[PDB]
From a paper:
The sole target for neutralizing antibodies on the virus surface is the envelope (Env) protein, a homotrimer consisting of three copies of gp120 and gp41 subunits that are associated by non-covalent interactions. Methods enabling the production of stable recombinant trimer immunogens based on the ectodomain of Env have catalyzed recent HIV vaccine efforts. Hence, the efficient trafficking of Env trimer immunogens to follicles following immunization is likely essential to promote optimal humoral responses to HIV. Here, we demonstrate two strategies to concentrate HIV Env immunogens in follicles, via the formation of immune complexes (ICs) or by employing self-assembling protein nanoparticles for multivalent display of Env antigens.
We employed a tetrahedral nanoparticle, T33_dn2, which consists of two trimeric building blocks (four copies of each), and can present four SOSIP trimers. For particle production, BG505 SOSIP-T33_dn2A was combined with equimolar amounts of the assembly component (T33_dn2B) and incubated for 24 h, leading to >90% assembly efficiency. An initial cryo-EM reconstruction of the entire nanoparticle verified the appropriate assembly to the target tetrahedral architecture with four BG505 SOSIP trimers flexibly linked to the nanoparticle core. The particle diameter is ~37 nm and the average apex–apex distance between the BG505 SOSIP trimers is 31 nm. Due to the flexible nature of the linker connecting the BG505 SOSIP antigen and T33_dn2A scaffold, high-resolution reconstruction of the entire nanoparticle as a single model could not be performed. However, focused refinement in combination with partial signal subtraction allowed us to treat the nanoparticle core (consisting of T33_dn2A and T33_dn2B) and the displayed BG505 SOSIP trimers as separate subparticles and analyze them independently. Using the approach described in the “Methods” section and Supplementary Fig. 3a, we reconstructed a 4.6 Å resolution map of the nanoparticle core and a 4.5 Å resolution map of the BG505 SOSIP trimer. The refined model of the T33_dn2 nanoparticle core revealed a high degree of correlation with the design model predicted by Rosetta at the backbone level. When compared to Rosetta models, Cα root-mean-square deviation values for the trimeric T33_dn2A and T33_dn2B components were 1.20 and 0.81 Å, respectively. The C-terminal helix in T33_dn2B was not resolved in the EM map, suggesting a high degree of flexibility, which may be at least partially influenced by the 6xHis-tag immediately following this sequence.
Numbering used by the authors:
A (entry chain F), C (entry chain A): 1 to 122
B (entry chain Q), D (entry chain B), E (entry chain N): 2 to 99
């Protein structure tokens, strides 16, 4: 009925837990920050990062995709999505996602390295 | 002693003795993996020998250590171009301009 | 639709985490206990305590203030609010909050020590 | 040896040799910081010398160690009063009564 | 450090601060049990405080260490007298004369 800064408190806690490697806690915290306000691309992104840290990349994909739906200029989300797709053997999507990251930032050398491998693995 | 290996690498490179330069750079790098310039030049030596896959691997490594090296970005684009990796070559070329 | 003891479970978990110094978890737990029932001055207070432990004293202030809104006789909340204001350089509020704590309990020697310093810093 | 320093402190205090008493109490306290009575008496010696800020600091410390010492509460109130800290002096005086 | 404790004892004793003197003498004695004079003065401090049983115990100890102290014999007699131990007080008084 109030809790005006709820999302902020949960978000900040999520960030602390992510930094400390406590991804399960961070997932809970980010999820809660978003649960009452699912409009923060940063939290969707960090939720994806925590999921990525966990290893369940498919969950990470959904979260990163949502971050892009809120903000398509998040090159890093594009990159990690490409990485998630790459990990799953989906080299065709890995390529598309890495290319999008590079259109946003052509100097992302890691996206280039991973794109090169995706084309070779494809 | 990596510093001496490095210098041999540069000398051999300049003289066209790329096979010598490659071994010498690898020696220097084995001892000191963070020498971005040596990685770049190693990539150039491989490029000169036609191994454009190795040239790519080393240009990328050099760039990870130093993202500002426009020449590595450019040469990365060249090696990619040689391999038919045109979208990538274009991106690397743009990265050099950026 | 049920969860009759939800707040209690979350509150108790919050207390355990506070005791163990796990303030981020404790904040989440207290927040949840209150989120579905924001009427426990003790939880507002302990939420404030966990925030105080975290160091984000401004958040601690809001939580302690709410505890006082629910129960103005919480001298300890008055004290920590005074401490939070003091930390922020607001010596004028630090004074008012410490005095209120002392009206409730004149023997709170720490509130007196901190009040003395607030008057000197003012 | 803190126990002997303590006794010297009390003797000097009673005799009006507050400067001696202060050093002696500080010696005893340096060795044993939890002696609330010595902190109280230290505060009293400072009070007697006109240093009411130090008297306050020590009365508060003595009270933290022993909140029941009505005399420390009272003397705290007196030192506060001397410094013009009247709301505080009143609170401390009430604390002594409580 | 017993020597300093001893001196504090004498000073406190002379000044009438018998409670301080008692603790100080006990400190000196704990470190050095053969100080007959300190035992005597300890007994005197107890005597002054009305504890005539302790005064007796210490006068006897002082006398065991030094049987020639007529004053301890006399004060022993006084403490005994105070306790109603008259035959004993008389003997101790005579012992002082002997």
């Amino acid at each position: 009925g109030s809790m005006g800064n709820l999302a902020e408190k949960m978000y900040k806690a999520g960030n602390a837990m992510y930094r400390k490697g406590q991804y399960t806690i961070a997932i809970i915290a980010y999820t809660l920050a978003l649960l009452k306000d699912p409009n923060n691309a940063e939290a969707w992104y960090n939720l994806g990062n925590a999921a990525y840290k966990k290893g369940e990349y498919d969950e990470a994909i959904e979260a990163y995709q949502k971050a892009l739906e809120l903000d398509p200029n998040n090159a890093e989300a594009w990159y990690n999505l490409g990485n998630a797709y790459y990990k799953q053997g989906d080299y065709d999507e890995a390529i598309e996602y890495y290319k999008k990251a590079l259109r946003l930032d052509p100097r992302n050398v890691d996206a280039i390295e991973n794109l090169i491998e995706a084309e070779e693995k494809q | 002693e990596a510093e001496l290996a490095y210098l041999l690498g540069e000398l051999a490179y300049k003289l066209g003795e790329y096979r010598i330069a490659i071994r010498a750079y690898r020696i220097a790098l084995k001892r000191d993996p963070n020498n971005a310039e040596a990685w770049y030049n190693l990539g150039n030596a491989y490029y000169k020998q036609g191994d454009y896959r190795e040239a790519i691997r080393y240009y990328l490594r050099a760039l990870k250590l130093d993202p500002e090296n426009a020449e590595a970005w450019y040469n990365l684009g060249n090696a990619l171009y040689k391999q038919g990796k045109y979208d990538l070559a274009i991106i690397a070329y743009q990265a050099a301009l950026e």
